[PDB]
Ligand SMILES: Nc1ncnc2c1ncn2[C@@H]1O[C@H](COP(=O)(O)OP(=O)(O)OP(=O)(O)O)C[C@H]1O
Ligand SMILES: Nc1ncnc2c1ncn2[C@@H]1O[C@H](COP(=O)(O)OP(=O)(O)OP(=O)(O)O)C[C@H]1O
């Protein structure tokens with residue numbers, strides 16, 4: 001009953017997979033420095049725009065003079081039509097709207113894998129690590145439209161990010177449906193900035209959407225943060241590790257694409273909550289996760305936010321080529337792991353398990369002969 005054991009292959013912080021995935025302190029500090037840069041500029045742009053609104057409260061300035069004031073701020077890094085729109089929105093505000101804007105100071109909170117500590121070093125060329133830093137606009141509760149304006153809020157956050165891109169060589173701006181993004185290719189890094197409306201201080205946490213039908217959706221990122229932290233407490237310290245490993249698998253199997261990180265987390269928590277496993281052998285634990293993921297994904301992976309009816313990964317009847325590919329690779333994973341376990345030699349064991357996680361771990365002495 002001889003096997004190969006991979007517990008150190010997975011967990012070793014020198015040169016096992018944890019060692020290869022976890023950011024160095026310098027890398028983490030660089031991301032925190034990037035976050036601060038964005039936060040300070042967003043703060044500044046809002047103070048600048050408020051200064052113009054303050055002037056208009058004092059005196060009903062002409063549109064031309066408001067434009068001139070806009071053009072001397074960071075908003076100058078938007079397009080001509082975008083600057084005109086900002087000036088027009090400030091010109092068009094009634095007294096109550098203007099007073100609400102003059103009271104607005106954006107707040108910030110990091111979400112995603114930087115926040116709950118599952119951010120992996122990227123693997124393939126082109127792949128990037130990111131930090132997701134949300135900007136929050138405290139304002140009165142609204143049903144349909146806020147008393148400051150979706151359009152103005154997005155223009156000002158865009159102005160912030162674009163002003164930074166203009167000042168930093170090798171930085172590039174990208175608009176997404178749920179965020180503005182600064183990409184820094186040479187640093188294999190981007191920062192995503194989702195924007196939320198919240199009350200002036202979960203049902204009233206509203207994510208801004210860039211294009212389409214709905215300008216807002218109720219999506220409180222703290223629901224996911226709290227669910228995952230609670231899950232780590234409930235299941236144990238290995239949950240963060242196996243979530244990292246499943247994301248590393250995804251990065252190795254797909255250059256571009258694959259299932260979302262949050263779908264992997266949700267399915268893995270469901271499996272570990274409901275299936276016996278042993279944290280002293282994370283090789284066996286990974287095999288157990290891999291055996292059960294196909295069924296989790298085939299039925300559709302539900303969001304931990306119960307108010308979100310949209311699945312994190314759709315059920316089988318809604319699959320196209322991409323979802324079919326994901327199912328195929330999920331089905332292959334337990335077979336890869338099983339073959340690695342019974343390989344003829346340590347070097348073949350390493351070669352095989354690296355077909356799941358990529359050729360990152362090279363130290364075959366992390367794999368030891370065992371019985372199972
Ligand atoms: N479909 C979704 N439903 C609800 N929240 C989502 C969804 N996709 C992303 N989020 C929110 O955004 C956060 C960041 O997402 P994302 O960058 O995809 O994951 P992550 O956990 O940061 O993993 P990576 O390490 O970046 O791959 C996590 C969650 O609070
Ligand atoms: N409820 C939500 N639904 C979707 N995305 C969300 C939600 N809440 C926050 N986000 C933001 O979306 C970001 C990742 O979304 P996504 O648009 O899938 O980027 P991606 O994973 O690079 O894929 P694409 O760039 O869209 O192909 C991370 C997070 O900051």
Ligand SMILES: [Mg+2]
Pocket residue numbers: 112113114130131132
């Ligand atoms: Mg992220």
